[PDB]
């Protein structure tokens, strides 16, 4: 999948207000335009960095203007371009504190010898905790600790305009089980409790626009196809995070049961 949908092209676009989609057909990456430079939200696979840089350019944004790189979570499909872009731009990397060891080592937790899941190691300039505010110029994002998919998985909240009114955006960090081990030798200590706390947290947030590190988190392609001038922004769907977190919780139960049965 990493060399299929995850590397397939998608045309960059203005998603809402100062948030621009610059990812691929299978990995979501965002530029947030501020009055004092750009924030880059995530990157893609290590081999896709040039592609992401080209997408930023298609919008007329300058890679050189990136001041901050923020991470949702520290897996190679989101961190693959951090070392390269950080060195090129002098940007600072901001990430959840418990993902710092993963970022700085370039490894998958609980599977550290797996070179196919490695990525170029990168230093974290600011390690964030719940409620920390990251500001560049006119723009502030708030960190929310939503661990499970990774130990330092961070969901980022910010306010945008839709016409004259405020709308709340969440870059949800991911809540899938994916490659993680939940029992036996869990991927990290306390993983199960983290996931279940995160589903509850997500369902309690008041979020107008759900975003995520893969477009399938929020059905990006269907919304993009419906978008046009003089029609409501299809990315505004305030009920979506509750619905999505409910689906994630149901799949989590299925995987926990499957992995528990496999222990025998
Ligand atoms: Zn991941
Ligand atoms: Zn991912
Ligand atoms: Zn929070």
Short mmCIF file of C-alpha atoms and ligand atoms in Angstrom, two decimals:
data_model
loop_
_atom_site.label_atom_id
_atom_site.label_comp_id
_atom_site.label_asym_id
_atom_site.label_seq_id
_atom_site.Cartn_x
_atom_site.Cartn_y
_atom_site.Cartn_z
CA UNK A 1 0.00 0.00 0.00
CA UNK A 2 2.92 2.33 0.83
CA UNK A 3 4.10 2.13 -2.80
CA UNK A 4 0.56 2.32 -4.21
CA UNK A 5 -2.17 4.69 -2.92
CA UNK A 6 0.29 6.34 -0.51
CA UNK A 7 2.55 7.51 -3.37
CA UNK A 8 -0.23 8.26 -5.93
CA UNK A 9 -0.68 11.90 -6.97
CA UNK A 10 -3.38 14.23 -5.77
CA UNK A 11 -3.67 17.87 -6.84
CA UNK A 12 -3.06 20.27 -3.94
CA UNK A 13 -5.88 22.61 -2.95
CA UNK A 14 -7.12 25.18 -0.48
CA UNK A 15 -9.14 23.06 1.94
CA UNK A 16 -10.49 25.75 4.28
CA UNK A 17 -9.26 29.29 4.94
CA UNK A 18 -5.48 29.10 5.59
CA UNK A 19 -5.26 25.26 5.48
CA UNK A 20 -4.01 23.72 2.24
CA UNK A 21 -3.84 20.02 1.31
CA UNK A 22 -0.44 19.10 -0.23
CA UNK A 23 -0.39 15.33 0.34
CA UNK A 24 -0.82 12.30 -1.87
CA UNK A 25 -3.88 10.22 -2.74
CA UNK A 26 -3.19 8.18 0.42
CA UNK A 27 -1.19 10.30 2.92
CA UNK A 28 -2.46 13.69 4.04
CA UNK A 29 -0.02 16.59 4.42
CA UNK A 30 -0.99 20.21 5.04
CA UNK A 31 0.41 23.72 4.74
CA UNK A 32 -0.98 26.30 7.16
CA UNK A 33 -0.34 29.83 5.92
CA UNK A 34 0.37 32.34 8.68
CA UNK A 35 1.25 36.02 8.67
CA UNK A 36 4.82 35.11 9.70
CA UNK A 37 5.57 32.11 7.48
CA UNK A 38 4.30 28.58 6.93
CA UNK A 39 3.53 25.66 9.19
CA UNK A 40 3.96 22.23 7.67
CA UNK A 41 1.73 19.53 9.20
CA UNK A 42 3.46 16.16 8.66
CA UNK A 43 5.31 14.80 5.63
CA UNK A 44 4.88 11.50 3.75
CA UNK A 45 6.97 8.38 3.03
CA UNK A 46 10.74 8.95 2.97
CA UNK A 47 10.77 8.45 -0.83
CA UNK A 48 8.01 11.02 -1.38
CA UNK A 49 9.67 14.15 0.02
CA UNK A 50 10.36 15.65 -3.41
CA UNK A 51 6.74 15.04 -4.36
CA UNK A 52 5.52 16.89 -1.24
CA UNK A 53 7.87 19.81 -1.91
CA UNK A 54 6.56 20.00 -5.47
CA UNK A 55 2.97 20.03 -4.17
CA UNK A 56 3.77 22.99 -1.91
CA UNK A 57 5.16 24.75 -5.00
CA UNK A 58 2.06 24.08 -7.10
CA UNK A 59 0.20 26.42 -4.74
CA UNK A 60 2.90 29.11 -4.95
CA UNK A 61 4.10 28.49 -1.42
CA UNK A 62 7.82 28.45 -0.80
CA UNK A 63 9.39 25.52 1.02
CA UNK A 64 11.93 28.07 2.26
CA UNK A 65 9.15 29.84 4.16
CA UNK A 66 8.36 26.87 6.43
CA UNK A 67 9.13 27.95 10.03
CA UNK A 68 7.58 25.09 11.97
CA UNK A 69 7.00 21.45 11.21
CA UNK A 70 4.34 19.78 13.36
CA UNK A 71 3.81 16.04 13.70
CA UNK A 72 0.60 14.12 14.40
CA UNK A 73 2.50 10.89 15.15
CA UNK A 74 5.93 9.44 14.63
CA UNK A 75 5.56 6.71 11.96
CA UNK A 76 7.55 6.72 8.69
CA UNK A 77 4.53 7.47 6.50
CA UNK A 78 4.26 10.86 8.25
CA UNK A 79 7.83 11.57 9.27
CA UNK A 80 9.71 10.45 6.18
CA UNK A 81 10.57 13.98 5.07
CA UNK A 82 11.27 15.66 8.43
CA UNK A 83 15.06 15.37 8.53
CA UNK A 84 15.35 16.63 4.96
CA UNK A 85 12.91 19.53 5.19
CA UNK A 86 14.21 20.61 8.60
CA UNK A 87 17.80 20.81 7.35
CA UNK A 88 16.79 22.60 4.12
CA UNK A 89 14.63 25.22 5.87
CA UNK A 90 16.00 25.59 9.38
CA UNK A 91 12.45 25.00 10.65
CA UNK A 92 11.77 23.76 14.17
CA UNK A 93 10.09 20.38 14.71
CA UNK A 94 7.24 20.25 17.23
CA UNK A 95 5.89 16.91 18.44
CA UNK A 96 4.26 15.11 21.34
CA UNK A 97 6.80 14.46 24.07
CA UNK A 98 6.32 10.66 24.16
CA UNK A 99 7.06 10.43 20.43
CA UNK A 100 10.41 12.21 20.89
CA UNK A 101 12.37 8.95 21.27
CA UNK A 102 10.76 7.58 18.09
CA UNK A 103 11.54 10.69 16.06
CA UNK A 104 15.08 10.96 17.35
CA UNK A 105 15.81 7.27 16.71
CA UNK A 106 13.94 6.82 13.42
CA UNK A 107 12.34 3.52 14.47
CA UNK A 108 8.94 1.82 14.86
CA UNK A 109 8.19 1.26 18.57
CA UNK A 110 8.32 -2.41 19.61
CA UNK A 111 9.76 -3.29 16.19
CA UNK A 112 13.00 -1.32 16.24
CA UNK A 113 15.03 -3.69 14.05
CA UNK A 114 12.55 -3.47 11.18
CA UNK A 115 14.45 -1.38 8.63
CA UNK A 116 11.41 -1.18 6.36
CA UNK A 117 9.65 0.91 9.03
CA UNK A 118 12.66 3.12 9.78
CA UNK A 119 12.97 6.76 8.73
CA UNK A 120 15.71 9.39 8.84
CA UNK A 121 16.20 10.39 12.48
CA UNK A 122 15.33 13.94 13.41
CA UNK A 123 15.72 16.08 16.53
CA UNK A 124 12.64 17.50 18.25
CA UNK A 125 12.93 21.21 19.04
CA UNK A 126 9.77 21.51 21.11
CA UNK A 127 8.19 18.54 22.87
CA UNK A 128 4.54 19.29 23.57
CA UNK A 129 2.01 18.25 26.19
CA UNK A 130 -1.78 18.53 26.45
CA UNK A 131 -2.95 22.13 26.04
CA UNK A 132 0.34 23.59 24.80
CA UNK A 133 -0.16 26.41 22.33
CA UNK A 134 2.01 26.71 19.24
CA UNK A 135 1.86 30.16 17.64
CA UNK A 136 3.31 31.51 14.42
CA UNK A 137 2.18 35.05 13.57
CA UNK A 138 -1.62 35.20 13.37
CA UNK A 139 -2.08 31.45 13.86
CA UNK A 140 -2.23 29.28 17.00
CA UNK A 141 -2.63 25.51 17.22
CA UNK A 142 -3.36 23.71 20.48
CA UNK A 143 -1.88 20.31 21.25
CA UNK A 144 -4.15 17.52 22.46
CA UNK A 145 -2.60 14.33 23.82
CA UNK A 146 -4.41 11.47 22.05
CA UNK A 147 -2.07 8.50 22.45
CA UNK A 148 -2.64 4.93 21.32
CA UNK A 149 -1.69 4.71 17.66
CA UNK A 150 1.67 6.02 18.90
CA UNK A 151 2.73 6.87 22.45
CA UNK A 152 2.96 10.60 21.72
CA UNK A 153 0.18 10.86 19.11
CA UNK A 154 -0.91 14.53 19.13
CA UNK A 155 -4.10 15.95 17.68
CA UNK A 156 -3.88 19.62 16.77
CA UNK A 157 -6.76 22.08 17.10
CA UNK A 158 -7.07 25.48 15.42
CA UNK A 159 -9.74 28.03 14.50
CA UNK A 160 -10.50 29.11 10.95
CA UNK A 161 -13.05 31.35 9.25
CA UNK A 162 -15.96 30.22 7.16
CA UNK A 163 -17.41 33.50 5.98
CA UNK A 164 -17.74 35.60 9.14
CA UNK A 165 -17.91 32.73 11.62
CA UNK A 166 -15.36 30.66 13.47
CA UNK A 167 -14.99 26.95 12.79
CA UNK A 168 -12.87 24.53 14.86
CA UNK A 169 -10.50 22.22 12.98
CA UNK A 170 -8.85 19.11 14.40
CA UNK A 171 -5.89 17.45 12.75
CA UNK A 172 -6.70 14.12 14.39
CA UNK A 173 -3.52 12.14 14.95
CA UNK A 174 -4.86 8.64 14.05
CA UNK A 175 -6.67 6.02 16.13
CA UNK A 176 -6.27 2.90 14.00
CA UNK A 177 -4.73 -0.30 15.35
CA UNK A 178 -2.80 -0.88 12.12
CA UNK A 179 0.54 -2.60 12.89
CA UNK A 180 0.39 -2.20 16.68
CA UNK A 181 0.44 -5.11 19.11
CA UNK A 182 -2.12 -4.65 21.88
CA UNK A 183 -1.39 -7.71 24.03
CA UNK A 184 1.30 -10.36 24.51
CA UNK A 185 4.24 -8.05 23.97
CA UNK A 186 2.38 -4.74 23.54
CA UNK A 187 3.94 -2.19 21.20
CA UNK A 188 4.38 0.09 24.22
CA UNK A 189 3.33 0.04 27.88
CA UNK A 190 -0.27 1.12 28.46
CA UNK A 191 -1.30 1.08 24.80
CA UNK A 192 -4.79 -0.38 25.38
CA UNK A 193 -5.76 2.21 28.03
CA UNK A 194 -4.44 4.98 25.78
CA UNK A 195 -6.60 3.97 22.81
CA UNK A 196 -9.74 3.74 24.91
CA UNK A 197 -9.06 7.10 26.61
CA UNK A 198 -8.46 8.61 23.17
CA UNK A 199 -11.76 7.37 21.71
CA UNK A 200 -13.56 8.92 24.70
CA UNK A 201 -11.61 12.19 24.38
CA UNK A 202 -12.32 12.44 20.63
CA UNK A 203 -16.06 11.95 21.18
CA UNK A 204 -16.09 14.79 23.74
CA UNK A 205 -14.44 17.42 21.51
CA UNK A 206 -16.46 20.06 19.67
CA UNK A 207 -14.97 19.96 16.17
CA UNK A 208 -16.43 21.40 12.96
CA UNK A 209 -13.79 20.14 10.51
CA UNK A 210 -12.18 16.73 10.96
CA UNK A 211 -8.80 16.27 9.33
CA UNK A 212 -6.30 13.44 9.72
CA UNK A 213 -2.99 12.03 8.51
CA UNK A 214 -4.65 9.89 5.81
CA UNK A 215 -7.45 11.23 3.61
CA UNK A 216 -9.64 8.20 4.48
CA UNK A 217 -9.94 9.57 8.03
CA UNK A 218 -12.39 12.16 6.72
CA UNK A 219 -13.28 11.00 3.20
CA UNK A 220 -11.21 13.77 1.63
CA UNK A 221 -11.69 12.78 -2.02
CA UNK A 222 -15.51 12.74 -1.90
CA UNK A 223 -15.52 16.18 -0.22
CA UNK A 224 -12.96 17.64 -2.64
CA UNK A 225 -15.15 16.50 -5.57
CA UNK A 226 -18.17 18.31 -4.07
CA UNK A 227 -16.31 21.58 -3.52
CA UNK A 228 -17.10 24.69 -5.58
CA UNK A 229 -17.43 28.48 -5.24
CA UNK A 230 -20.92 29.42 -4.03
CA UNK A 231 -21.60 26.15 -2.18
CA UNK A 232 -21.03 25.29 1.51
CA UNK A 233 -17.53 23.97 2.29
CA UNK A 234 -18.00 20.16 2.35
CA UNK A 235 -15.20 19.76 4.90
CA UNK A 236 -17.48 21.26 7.56
CA UNK A 237 -19.21 18.27 9.15
CA UNK A 238 -19.41 18.77 12.94
CA UNK A 239 -20.67 15.26 13.80
CA UNK A 240 -17.89 13.45 12.01
CA UNK A 241 -15.30 12.96 14.76
CA UNK A 242 -17.88 11.28 17.03
CA UNK A 243 -18.98 8.97 14.19
CA UNK A 244 -15.39 8.23 13.21
CA UNK A 245 -14.16 7.61 16.77
CA UNK A 246 -17.14 5.27 17.27
CA UNK A 247 -16.06 3.28 14.19
CA UNK A 248 -12.46 3.19 15.45
CA UNK A 249 -13.58 1.90 18.85
CA UNK A 250 -15.57 -0.89 17.25
CA UNK A 251 -12.60 -1.94 15.12
CA UNK A 252 -10.36 -1.72 18.18
CA UNK A 253 -12.55 -4.22 20.03
CA UNK A 254 -12.38 -6.58 17.04
CA UNK A 255 -8.57 -6.37 16.87
CA UNK A 256 -8.10 -6.73 20.63
CA UNK A 257 -10.25 -9.87 20.53
CA UNK A 258 -8.34 -11.22 17.51
CA UNK A 259 -4.95 -10.55 19.10
CA UNK A 260 -6.12 -11.99 22.43
CA UNK A 261 -7.29 -15.20 20.73
CA UNK A 262 -3.91 -15.41 18.94
CA UNK A 263 -2.12 -15.50 22.34
CA UNK A 264 -3.21 -19.09 23.01
ZN1 LIG B 1 0.78 5.55 11.96
ZN1 LIG B 2 -0.18 6.62 8.82
ZN1 LIG B 3 -7.34 18.07 24.96
#
